[PDB]
Amino acid sequence: GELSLWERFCANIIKAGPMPKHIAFIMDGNRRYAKKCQVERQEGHSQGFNKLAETLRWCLNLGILEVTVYAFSIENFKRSKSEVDGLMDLARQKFSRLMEEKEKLQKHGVCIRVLGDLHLLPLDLQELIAQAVQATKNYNKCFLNVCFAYTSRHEISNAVREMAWGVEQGLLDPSDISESLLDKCLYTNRSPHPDILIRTSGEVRLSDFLLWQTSHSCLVFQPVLWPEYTFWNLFEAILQFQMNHSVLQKARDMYAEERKRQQLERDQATVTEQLLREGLQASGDAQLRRTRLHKLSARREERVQGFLQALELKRADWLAR
Amino acid sequence: GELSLWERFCANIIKAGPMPKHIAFIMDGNRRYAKKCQVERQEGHSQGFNKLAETLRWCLNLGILEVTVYAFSIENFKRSKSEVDGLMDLARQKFSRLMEEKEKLQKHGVCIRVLGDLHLLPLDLQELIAQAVQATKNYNKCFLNVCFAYTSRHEISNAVREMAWGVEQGLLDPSDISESLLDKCLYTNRSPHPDILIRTSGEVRLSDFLLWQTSHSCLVFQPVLWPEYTFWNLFEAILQFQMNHSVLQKARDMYAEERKRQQLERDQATVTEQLLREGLQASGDAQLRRTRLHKLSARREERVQGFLQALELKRADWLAR
Amino acid sequence: AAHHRMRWRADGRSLEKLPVHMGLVITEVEQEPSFSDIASLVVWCMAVGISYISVYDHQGIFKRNNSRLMDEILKQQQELLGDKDDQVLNCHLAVKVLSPEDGKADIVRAAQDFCQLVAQKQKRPTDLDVDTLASLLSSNGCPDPDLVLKFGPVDSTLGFLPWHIRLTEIVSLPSHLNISYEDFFSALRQYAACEQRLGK
Amino acid sequence: AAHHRMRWRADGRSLEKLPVHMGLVITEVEQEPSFSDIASLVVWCMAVGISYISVYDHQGIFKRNNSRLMDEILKQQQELLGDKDDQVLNCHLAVKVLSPEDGKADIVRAAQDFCQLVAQKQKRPTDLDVDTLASLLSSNGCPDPDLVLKFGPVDSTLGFLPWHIRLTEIVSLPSHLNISYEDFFSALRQYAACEQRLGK
Ligand SMILES: CC(C)=CCC/C(C)=C\CC/C(C)=C\CC/C(C)=C/CSP(=O)(O)OP(=O)(O)O
Ligand SMILES: CC(C)=CCC/C(C)=C\CC/C(C)=C\CC/C(C)=C/CSP(=O)(O)OP(=O)(O)O
Ligand SMILES: C=C(C)CCSP(=O)(O)OP(=O)(O)O
Ligand SMILES: C=C(C)CCSP(=O)(O)OP(=O)(O)O
Ligand SMILES: [Mg+2]
Ligand SMILES: [Mg+2]
């Protein structure tokens, strides 16, 4: 699926500027599309899958090698059994057709990750999912994250629960909990935060998708229904990103510099309190504030790196299987 | 008194490198010189004055425009009345011949400062001294500081007493006392610390001279007796300075950077304590630590600058007269 | 005054739905924000019947100038709309001034507080679900924002309460700098017309 | 051991005068100092009869490595010279490790302490003379250094106890790095030969 002349030309032009490394999609509007085409709702969703495959080829042709998609919300479990089963069966088809199509997965280096509270899915679907993930690890040429039975609050709650597990197990002190640590406990911990969040149809809301990860992302709300997505919709979204990029990255960097500044102030106030209780002075040629500060940080890093190594060990315990 | 060919040539050469802006002299060995020449001790000291005038002309010819000399120690009051009176009378001659020679003082812009516990000198001598100082203020082409009835411990003690006076009068908080403030209360507060300290005769000690001011100065102990000082002795001392200059100024700068670092740590620990007692956090987006820190420094500077303005007002109260 | 107050109340009641909590997000950093325009937005929200207003900028300018902002709100809550301490208390209850630390840093703070309870053998990791964490977020007893008005050229929420905006409608206006009541109310009827299906 | 101890004692007694307090000033910063050479200097001072030794460098290296220095002194105070806690206590009483903050910063500290007494109406400015200030210097009960051995290429005291060196004899050696007893003792007889007239 190569690009046409105009698509290729326009791609070359915008590639002279900053390009997103990671794009996230809320693929919304499948049912309204089915009503507009006078088709059953199941074919609205099947058309939705075909558009996902097409759009992924567009990203690849643009050098965007990591994509995250909202495929099923925990909230979507509230739909009718007829519709829920239809979606589960679609997932059963594609994840099984992802098998057989292996080696074509290895040849192109496609890593597949499926994120969410997967214990809510049918037991058989969890096995297919685990197979696809187990096979496509170690692949590193492109990355597709499928958010399946996912909400962002459920992901954030789980990250905190894992940090509380580290404390309960003794690998973590409550003082070690930080924004960065929570980042490394999310389901998305192996990918950078998305440069763009795209939601289709007319909705201007996030519907519990990547709330932590997209706090500084460029947000693009496009009226088109998802099964009607075109290359030029995608192109428009990237155009938005490029126009926002300088102010957005300065704000992203100011946020980071402000967080590190405040952390340094908090740590040095900690060193001050421990020094004040002790007869020891606030400052001195012995520079004991400076060595207490380095030990405070180093012992924190060793505890965190030990907790993360243990968290990844129990994450990679499937086996589930 | 111009330089000879060899002196001028050598001066031009070393002037290509760093030159001292301020040199301090302990003019020692006048009495041993008198014993060696078989002259009365009074002419040993009079020869000592002639050498001071000659050496000052050398400094001027070298672009060294500020010189500090140890002319009489408080400890020298312990000598015989015959010798003490001889020195006082020499001072009566030169300080009076400094008058009549005015206008020649104005034409060359010679500022004369006399530093020490001057209330120990004869009352008439204090009047001559005050005249010379009053006349040569506002002159700014070169500066000669005559340490008369001076010791460094007496100067340091007086500086602290002035800071204690500022507290007693309400212009100063005890927390405002600093190394820099003490610097500005010394007798030498209108001159930079000396680049070189030179002591003649064989003695390798400072004899209570400029202990605070020469802590980072290049120290030169030369065996020659002071009435025998030559241009080349002075040249040798400057040669020592130039060879020490890079390591000495790095140490002088590291000291300064370390003092400012420790002061910042002390001030921010102060801000921390006041913040901790209060419910207020160690850090925050409101950045109240950063505004409390600027107010702490600014209110300190205004108190210090008000104290210094009042100290100079009562210093310039002579009138003494 | 009784006429202007009645008119703004009828305006709010005429809409199909009103936000209980509105967020004002200012992204423009090319100039110091206009306190008088922000205060007019806040006073309109209160007069049309919106219970809570959060004012936010990613640089913390409003947070570092809290008193000037409140004073401007109070001034314009007179003149428009016609017990000073009662008026002060009622604005402190309705108006929150936020900065980035009220989002991710506050979630981290709640995690620290919860994890120290685990350390004290008073809670278990499994005791923390979605609703429990929301209970100790530091924004307890207050509803989540239904509507965010984003002003300026940045197409990002710039750190505004990421946990709380899961279903928030985000309406973008190009600038707050000479905002008019008609422009503000246009955004209100946009929110009134939006359809939230909650996953169904 | 009884022979080496007796010999060093007779050496000290043979001199016309011995310093009660010696300062060791290290200016060389082109390499980390040699702890074993500094300790040998300290142990020689003690064995010849010098009561106090101050070790100083303007970078504070000895102050930040106090334990390594003392441990090296203790080790060499055995082997040479032949109750460990008594030996530890006697070296802590004789050996001070100084940095620049023990000079000017300590004088400033004494000034702060004195000026707060004035603030409390318990002292007057005129109560502070030369000897009073020396009494609250933070180096009280200890004599001023009579002799400073300055090692290295810098012709400066580099901040070493400016108040206390008013009459200190300053002898310069080019390096401490492989210092010999004969070289150290040569400096001692130089101090022994010096004539202090005290202004008379
Ligand atoms: C897990 C699964 C189902 C498939 C796995 C394969 C995969 C990654 C995607 C297949 C399914 C795809 C592409 C999209 C369906 C996701 C979904 C529920 C979108 C909401 S459209 P709405 O229903 O809301 O329509 P309106 O808003 O118009 O009412
Ligand atoms: C105030 C006054 C006197 C003069 C004012 C004019 C002036 C600036 C200087 C004139 C006097 C001069 C040049 C030098 C005398 C200063 C002095 C006591 C030097 C010690 S030599 P020691 O006596 O110690 O001889 P040894 O060490 O060999 O025993
Ligand atoms: C799987 C998904 C793309 C779910 C997110 S889109 P959804 O239509 O469910 O969002 P709501 O209008 O809030 O119901
Ligand atoms: C006026 C002066 C130059 C005094 C300093 S030199 P002085 O000979 O007095 O120093 P001491 O040998 O300690 O007596
Ligand atoms: Mg939808
Ligand atoms: Mg002399």
Token pair recorded at residue B107: 């034409």
CA atoms within 13 A on the CB side of B25: 29
* CA distances (Å), origin A297, targets A176, A266, B131: 10, 12, 64
Instruction: Write phi, then psi, for A73 (nearest 5 degrees).
Output: -90, 145
CA dihedral A135, A141, A147, A151 (to 10 degrees): 120
Does D47 reside within a domain?
A: yes
Residues near B90 by beta carbon (within 8 Å), at least 6 away in sequence: B42, B45, B46, B49
- Beta-bridged to residue B26, according to DSSP, are B70, B199
CA dihedral C183, C188, C192, C198 (to 10 degrees): 120
* CA distances (Å), origin A217, targets C25, C152, C155, D69: 15, 16, 8, 56
Binding residue numbers of C for isopentenyl diphosphate? 198-199
Let me know: does A11 contact A5? Beta carbons within 8 Å. no
CA-based end-to-end distance of chain A: 34
In sequence order, what DSSP letters do the residues of D167-178 get, joined into one string? S-EEEEES--TT
Instruction: Write phi, then psi, for B76 (nearest 5 degrees).
Output: -70, -15
Residue of D nearest to A285 (CA): D60
Rounded to 10°, the helix A41-61/A81-98 angle is 40
3-state secondary structure of C84: helix
- Domains in chain A (CATH in brackets) are 5-258+302-303+305-316 (3.40.1180.10)
Does C196 reside within a domain?
A: no
Q: Containing H/E element for B22? A: strand B22-26
Token pair recorded at residue A234: 């995608």
Burial of A309 (0-12, 13-18, 19+ CB in 10 A): exposed
3-state secondary structure of B226: helix
Give residues after which chain D gaps, C-N over 2.5 angstroms. 82
Rounded Cα–Cα distance for residues B225 and B48 (Å) = 9
Token pair recorded at residue A32: 């309204």
Does D128 reside within a domain?
A: no
Question: Ligand 3 atom closest to Cα of A208?
Answer: 5
CA atoms within 13 A on the CB side of C47: 27
3-state secondary structure of A73: strand
Question: Ligand 3 atom closest to Cα of A75?
Answer: 9
Q: Which of B124, B170, B191, B151 is nearest to B70 (CA)?
A: B151
Rounded to 10°, the helix C181-193/C35-48 angle is 50
Residue of B nearest to A258 (CA): B285
CATH number, position C94:
3.40.1180.10
Long-range contact list for D149-152, CB < 8 A, 24+ apart?
A: D149/D22, D149/D23, D149/D24, D149/D25, D149/D41, D149/D173, D149/D184, D149/D187, D150/D25, D150/D27, D151/D24, D151/D25, D151/D26, D151/D27, D151/D28, D151/D175, D151/D176, D151/D179, D152/D26, D152/D27, D152/D28, D152/D29, D152/D176
Rounded Cα–Cα distance for residues A272 and B269 (Å) = 7
Assess D60–A contact: CB distance below 8 Å, yes or no.
Answer: yes
Assess A285–D contact: CB distance below 8 Å, yes or no.
Answer: yes
Does C105 reside within a domain?
A: no
Token pair recorded at residue B133: 């100082």
CA-based end-to-end distance of chain B: 34
Does D165 reside within a domain?
A: yes
Q: Which domain holds residue C35?
A: 2-100+144-190
Does C199 reside within a domain?
A: no
Which chain C residues are closer than 8 Å to A207 by Cβ? Answer: 166-167, 199
Assess D59–B contact: CB distance below 8 Å, yes or no.
Answer: yes
Let me know: does A164 contact C121? Beta carbons within 8 Å. no
Token pair recorded at residue A121: 């899915």
Would you list which residues of chain B are within 8 Å, Cβ to Cβ, of chain A?
Answer: 258, 261-263, 265-266, 268-269, 272-273, 276, 282-285, 289
Give the number of domains in chain D.
Answer: 1
Structure obtained using: X-ray
Q: Which amino acid is at C67?
A: S
Which chain D residues are closer than 8 Å to B214 by Cβ? Answer: 157, 162
Assess B208–D contact: CB distance below 8 Å, yes or no.
Answer: yes
Residue of D nearest to B180 (CA): D108
∠ Cα D39 D44 D45 (to 5°): 100
CA of B318 to the centre of ligand 5 (A): 91
